[PDB]
């Protein structure tokens, strides 16, 4: 009775284990800091109790005496995937398994 949907069952196994892999391998969010900055590797641990993040840029001084500021940047980046299309695909697989088995 299920002999002919075993292909679809394998496909559902794969389409689920690869999302478990995506969930397990990548990092959900990170603070991203950019720029020529001194970051104390110990102060970064206080990141959870911090309220103000202050980034002071490097001031480069030219041989001709001109002063100019490096770029500094800060923000959170987060892991994301195509939920709409993977859910539509796994919904279709599940629906087809139930349809063909009645």
């Amino acid at each position: 009775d299920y002999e002919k949907v075993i292909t679809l069952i394998d496909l559902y196994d794969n389409a689920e284990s690869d999302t478990a892999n995506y969930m397990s391998d990548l990092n959900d969010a990170m603070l991203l800091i950019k720029g020529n900055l001194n970051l104390d590797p110990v102060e970064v641990r206080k990141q959870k109790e911090a309220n103000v993040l202050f980034l002071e840029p490097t001031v480069y001084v030219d041989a001709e005496g001109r002063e100019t500021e490096g770029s500094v940047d800060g923000g959170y980046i987060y892991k994301q995937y195509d939920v709409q299309g993977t859910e539509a695909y796994k919904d279709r697989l599940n629906s087809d398994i139930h349809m063909f088995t009645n």
């Binding site: 720029g35 970064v44 911090a50 002071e56 005496g65």
Partner: peptide, 20 residues
């Protein structure tokens, strides 16, 4: 030379990231 002594010359100062 006298002016260079009185003014000196600034040098590249590296930035800081602080979480307070």
């Amino acid at each position: 030379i006298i002016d260079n002594y009185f003014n000196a010359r600034t040098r590249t100062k590296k930035g800081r990231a602080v979480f307070f």
